[PDB]
């Protein structure tokens, strides 16, 4: 379960690599880029990026073999979340990834993000029977949507 991350010019690399029983090693590589909007509080944007990385690591860890098969066209990534920089409030994150072959992967989770420290994964689970937008009204929060396209390739 080796991981590695690189960043340059607001572009990032995320890698997951595992040894095979065949005596060979193959790694999964993805890359994507993000923008920082000067009129939007950087503290929330910082948390969003870190959350994106954490959620992608979890998906890659669970479905490594499927992603080995998917050496090909860039995957579409969609994230919808309610994220605040306040330790007294739980954040909710939902991640969806769409394959070129039509396969869809989904995750959801909850996080706590202290403004000065790496985000903490929590034991609590997202409620699948309730629309997130409803939750945003009940506990006031801006709904944040973002999309990435990432290049999934495997080592040859």
């Amino acid at each position, epitope marked *: 379960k080796k991981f590695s991350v690189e960043e340059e010019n607001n572009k990032v690399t995320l890698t997951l690599c595992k040894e095979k029983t065949d005596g060979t090693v193959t790694c999964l590589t993805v890359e994507w880029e993000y923008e920082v909007n000067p009129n939007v509080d950087p503290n929330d944007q910082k948390a969003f990026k870190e959350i994106t990385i954490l959620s992608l690591k979890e998906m890659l860890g669970k479905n490594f073999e499927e992603f080995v098969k998917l050496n090909g066209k860039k995957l579409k990534v969609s994230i919808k979340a309610t994220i605040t920089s306040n*330790p007294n409030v739980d954040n909710e994150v939902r991640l969806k990834v769409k394959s070129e072959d039509g396969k869809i992967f989904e995750l959801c989770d909850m996080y706590r993000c202290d403004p000065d420290e790496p985000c903490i994964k929590t034991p609590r689970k997202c409620n699948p029977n309730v629309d997130l937008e409803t939750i945003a009204k009940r*506990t*006031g929060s801006r709904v944040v949507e973002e999309e990435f396209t990432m290049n999934l390739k495997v080592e040859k």
Partner: antibody
Framework: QVKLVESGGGVVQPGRSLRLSCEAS????????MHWVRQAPGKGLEWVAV????????YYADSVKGRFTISRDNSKNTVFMQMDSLRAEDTAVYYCHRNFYDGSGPFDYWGQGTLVTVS | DIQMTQSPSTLSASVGDRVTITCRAS??????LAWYQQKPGKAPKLLIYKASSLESGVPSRFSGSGSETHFTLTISSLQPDDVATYYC?????????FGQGTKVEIK
């Protein structure tokens, strides 16, 4: 059935230590911290201190720094507070307070509180 | 820290009068203000959170308003049972602070 209760109050002579605690039941102290809030008989609410569940996130009001210690009871869903070097200003009813927010909406609990006085 | 203040310390009114209480904050607290209500001899209870929405179980005549550094609480049609001390609370970070409080009294 979610409750927090106070104990250990009473009259304390100046300079003497006192130990207070928040005994609690109906929930497990595993995700959010607890606060101490105090009220002088003639005045509004004043915040005293917070302890995060097993956290390093300990904060104190300026008026009590160096005189108070907050610590979790590792064996129970209980929070301890110690105070030392008390002065006449420290006359208040102390309350246990717990508060957090989630997608379900607000959670806010208070105990009955206990009276602590000096001299 | 963050300083919290309230403009009136006491308001006088007859039943059915409109009542407004304001609260001010130092620095910048976005929309993280809460309002609390207390009756004599009892622990305080949360009324408003996120400087806006009512916690469930309370009547619609109460409403919050304002943002950033200035906030308002209004009571339409004051009832004799609404007589209480009201407090302004801040929760932007670890720990909390409280305002001076305002009393609502019936003449």
């Amino acid at each position: 059935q979610v409750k927090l209760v106070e104990s250990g109050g009473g009259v304390v002579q100046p300079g003497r230590s006192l130990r207070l605690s928040c005994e609690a039941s109906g929930f497990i102290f595993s995700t959010y911290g607890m606060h101490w809030v105090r009220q002088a008989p003639g005045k509004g609410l004043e915040w005293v201190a917070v302890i995060w569940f097993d956290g390093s996130n300990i904060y104190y009001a300026d008026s009590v720094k160096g005189r108070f210690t907050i610590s979790r009871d590792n064996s129970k869903n209980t929070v301890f507070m110690q105070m030392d070097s008390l002065r006449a200003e420290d006359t208040a009813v102390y309350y246990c307070h717990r508060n957090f927010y989630d997608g379900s909406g607000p959670f806010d609990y208070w105990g009955q509180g206990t009276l602590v006085t000096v001299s | 820290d963050i300083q919290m203040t309230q403009s009136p310390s006491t308001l006088s009114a007859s039943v059915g009068d409109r009542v407004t209480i304001t609260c001010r904050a130092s620095q910048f607290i976005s929309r993280w203000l809460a309002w609390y209500q207390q009756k004599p001899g009892k622990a305080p209870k949360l009324l408003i959170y996120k400087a806006s929405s009512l916690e469930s179980g309370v009547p619609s005549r109460f409403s919050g308003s304002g943002s950033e550094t200035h906030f308002t609480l209004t009571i339409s049609s004051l009832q004799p049972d609404d007589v209480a001390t009201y407090y302004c609370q801040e929760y932007t970070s670890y720990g909390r602070t409280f305002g001076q409080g305002t009393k609502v009294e019936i003449k």
